[PDB]
Paper text:
Coxsackie virus B5 (CVB5) is a member of Enterovirus-B (EV-B) species, which can cause various human diseases, such as viral encephalitis; herpangina; hand, foot, and mouth disease (HFMD); aseptic meningitis; and acute flaccid paralysis (1–3). Similar to other EV-B species, CVB5 is a nonenveloped, positive-sense single-strand RNA (+ssRNA) virus. P2, and P3 will break down into nonstructural proteins responsible for genome replication, whereas P1 is the precursor form of structural proteins VP1-VP4, which could be packaged into an icosahedral capsid. Here, we determined the atomic structures of CVB5 in three forms: mature full (F) particle (2.73 Å), intermediate altered (A) particle (2.81 Å), and procapsid empty (E) particle (2.95 Å).
The samples corresponding to both the bands were pooled and mixed for analysis by analytical ultracentrifugation (AUC), which suggested two types of particles–one containing RNA and the other lacking RNA with sedimentation coefficients of 143S and 80S, respectively. Compared with the map of the F particle, both maps of A and E particles had an expansion of ~4% with large openings on the 2-fold axes. The procapsid E particle and uncoating intermediate A particle of CVB5 were structurally almost indistinguishable, each with an expansion of ~4% in capsid radius, compared with the compact mature F particle, which is different from E3 and E30, whose procapsid E particles were comparable to the F particle but smaller than the A particle. However, no empty particle with a smaller radius was found after several rounds of 3D no-alignment classifications using different batches of particles, which is just like E18, CVB1 (13, 20). This is different from what has been found in the cases of E3, E30, E6, and E11, where an empty particle with a similar radius to the compacted F particle could be observed. We noted that the first seven residues of VP1 visualized on A particle would traverse the capsid and stop on the surface of the capsid, which was distinctive from the E particle where the corresponding residues were disordered, and all the other remaining residues were present on the interior of the capsid. But by analogy with other enteroviruses, the presence of pocket factor and myristoylistic acid in the mature F particle but not immature E particle and intermediate A particle, suggests that both the two molecules play important roles in the stabilization and integrity of mature virions for most of the EV-Bs.
Author numbering:
A (entry chain 2): 12 to 43, 52 to 258
B (entry chain 3), C (entry chain 3): 1 to 181, 186 to 238
D (entry chain 1), E (entry chain 1): 55 to 281
Amino acid sequence: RVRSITLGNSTITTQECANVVVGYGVWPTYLNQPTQPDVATCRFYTLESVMWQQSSPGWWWKFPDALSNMGLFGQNMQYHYLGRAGYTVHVQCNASKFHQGCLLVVCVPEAEMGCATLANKPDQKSLSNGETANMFESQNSTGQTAVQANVINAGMGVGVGNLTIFPHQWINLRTNNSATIVMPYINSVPMDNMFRHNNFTLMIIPFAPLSYSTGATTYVPITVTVAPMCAEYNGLRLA
Amino acid sequence: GLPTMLTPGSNQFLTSDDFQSPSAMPQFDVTPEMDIPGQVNNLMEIAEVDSVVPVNNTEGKVLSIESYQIPVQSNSTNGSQVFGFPLMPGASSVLNRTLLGEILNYYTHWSGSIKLTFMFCGSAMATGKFLLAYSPPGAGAPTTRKEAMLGTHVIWDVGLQSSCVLCIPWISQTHYRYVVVAGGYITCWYQTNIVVPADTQSDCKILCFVSACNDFSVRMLKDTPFIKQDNFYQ
Amino acid sequence: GLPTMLTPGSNQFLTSDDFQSPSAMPQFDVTPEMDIPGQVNNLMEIAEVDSVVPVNNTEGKVLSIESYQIPVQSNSTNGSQVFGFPLMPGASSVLNRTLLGEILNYYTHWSGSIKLTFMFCGSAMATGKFLLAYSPPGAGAPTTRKEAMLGTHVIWDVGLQSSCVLCIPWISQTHYRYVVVAGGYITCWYQTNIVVPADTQSDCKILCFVSACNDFSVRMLKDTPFIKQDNFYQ
Amino acid sequence: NYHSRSESTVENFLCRSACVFYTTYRNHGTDGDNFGYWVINTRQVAQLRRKLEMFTYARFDLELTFVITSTQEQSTIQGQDSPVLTHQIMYVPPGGPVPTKVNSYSWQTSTNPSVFWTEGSAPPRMSIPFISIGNAYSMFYDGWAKFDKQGTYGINTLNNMGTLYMRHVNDGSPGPIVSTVRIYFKPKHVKTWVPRPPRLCQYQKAGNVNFEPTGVTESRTDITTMQ
Amino acid sequence: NYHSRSESTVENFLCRSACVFYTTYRNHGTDGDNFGYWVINTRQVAQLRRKLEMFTYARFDLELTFVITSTQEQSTIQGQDSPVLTHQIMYVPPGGPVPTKVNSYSWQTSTNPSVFWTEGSAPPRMSIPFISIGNAYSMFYDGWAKFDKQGTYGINTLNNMGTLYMRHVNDGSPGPIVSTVRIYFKPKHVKTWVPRPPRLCQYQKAGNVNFEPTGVTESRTDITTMQ
């Protein structure tokens, strides 16, 4: 049936029979200066939808940078020196029964991406545009400081078909339309500066191209909604 | 004072030894371990994971994502072959660079069952049947729909299910076989054409996945034949 | 007679080893230990001790005892800054040569809380208030009295108490941080002017003390960057 | 029953002693550049780098074995009769003093670990613990050391494991002698997290993940072909 | 919980093996000055001297390791073919006979401890106990050995730890050979009393506490500045 989920002043709609992929089998928790929690940040931040077309390569978001300007939790990234949060990423897909296509929705921890120019580093804008998705290309990328965003190598110098090693979900339009991934906090330190470290990125790569019957809508909206979980920060006490 | 002998093999550096090494930084406290999610203790955990198989290995497609998409034609002769590759996870280029094949190429011997999943990426209203036929090693790939049906096969009905998991058994004369270059064959056949509400234009696709089963093992570690360096990178 | 191997690392002199050394003077009786007062077993006992912080580090004052005296002006703008230094016990020259900083410079990593004591050395009839404000690392030093008050602060009232102990918390992303070159800031602000029986001429002073708390530790011993020799002194 | 997965384990997979560096240093020289050095890195040998980068975070001890062999050179010096040669392998921990000359003050190694080895014995060995203020080495870092600088992408000071320095304690003879150190590297007590796909594209730089895009696999003639 | 203070302890702080002296002695010479010597002192190396003088009284055993390496010199002698070189490191306890020549009667060492070491083996090692008629070594002495003499200020005979003597037992070859001893010092079982401020002004003389007055710290521009 229909499941209604409310966090804070945000409500989303989910199917009862929705499969949830929980990271590496780990549910986000706190680290049980005393760290300060912020439950007000536990909201649904629905990003702008991306139009999935017949010739559309994948997208990616880097979420510390993606939610950097999303009201609360963005003010908290700007405010607190140290921060920690797990995320519930819910990727919806609005399509009819006459639409085709398969999607790989994968969250990649520490997706250090290469540059189009070998003797160069990608700049901040190319790696993450924030709430705006960065798109892959079907061919090699050219640029002095641009990310090598060819789809086959997923920007990481690996095989895109091997991306399933990370917490992923398959959206087959004839079978599924949604993907819920619950990513815990993954890092080599208990807590890190959020403004300069993307702990993971979300890649939505269409492995089977979108197709549709004549007269059906050409594009299929893909909606990403992110709910930070167990977010806690530095804490300012004693003088 | 206590007598001792030469014991041949002393004062030698055997590279594959397990002798204790003196600590250059004793009386130094390392930071305690942190509960990082994702503790992996064995490479088979990586090998147990489904990885998309590039079956569309035709020239000009290995540089695009179309190498992973098996094209299913809107109209074709019944009994035509949709695709076919040998069961050589560490040798055949179809399965070589998968997660399973990448793990296998780090070793010399392997044993176990290959798990193959075929997923139909067509429309929900599309219906049709496929022959997912398996040929045992030494038999040879079938040439017609009838030869595939007379052997080991499943009728994968697209309308009933959009996925088909096919577990390839372990058939060899030894406990382990060499990763390098028989193994068998997977061939798919058009049992029936794909049937749709007669208004569509583009064709459907099939995605393939490969995985290892719980009885999978690798014996002799070696250097992978994939990464190569002329000298030190710095 | 008993067989023995080479065990690589033998016949070597590792400087940081703990092997027993033959006694050049055995069968010699050392004098018994005497109960000397002041047995110290750990350098933190030295680091736990308050030491006067030279905050008046202006040019020309480091060679005089005035470097330890924070001048409190008889008349100044309210909301002016009395003083300010960063929380770098092993890096900032204000805290570098203190007992705590001297201990810290012998090590590479450290962790713990800094204890700061500010003592008013003015007259018993003098009264006034100060803002002892603490800025967490990365925040930046406040520029006005209001910014200091909106953060972590205490109102140190001179009339009520002539001393103020301020415990600086441990805020870092790692268990230990490097002694060498964020840490935070201490800034004092004139909440109110110093009020006296209106007949005095010279100004008051503030003395600062630094100390380590019970949770203080240092990890990697090294050479202090302070003493230097060209060769042997004899 | 089930076949044993013993040598497939991460410990057996990664704890393999491999040569990661070799350098030659002279016994006499014009300047003081008669010493060999190596910043301890895991990203200079492709095989080891690929094996370690199959995981995201690792935590291991460094076991190092040094295979030092000396060769007498050319001619024009007679009556060489050199005594036995002694070598010093000084390890500089992170943040420690770094020599610039063969006879620098850092070689007096007040706190830098140092092993003195005389030729003819078993090769010298030393073990470096897990040295990081962080809780694990990070083979991948999707972030900046300083967010202001673009060139700091992927660099964090938590992976610095120190530098090794090698030199001759004694010249032995007035004639030329060149020694090769041939460091052999072996992780111990390895714990790894967050497995990653194997590196497909060939490496370009040790301090980069940059890559020329490569095909996912090798091509074949037809989708139905068998050879 | 509380972080471990293990390596901050006085034992870990002070029991660190450091080189405190090195000398070269010949195999042939005009006079008998073919020997090296070192009066055991803790006030000649600034780092160790500062570390010990952070306390007032100390009581420790001296562990000494000698790193002896020999070098053949120049030319004009052919067919050197020297056999292996043997060294004698004689320790002279306080009040013991002190050699003045390479072949003095004191080298026959009736009661002076002596270690004979052949080159190519592990470096020689010997340990000196706490040798003082007093109950502790005093790094500082606010008094006179003789109150009549002004120049005896700060000198007491209770800190004399003996003298080390090094020489060649055999010449080996008729050609020149020079050996360096490189003594490495390491206190053991250290007990310290009455902690003291670290030495701020640079040392001038080993047998003095004299100092040029120095500023308490480094200066900055303003009392309110941050960089």
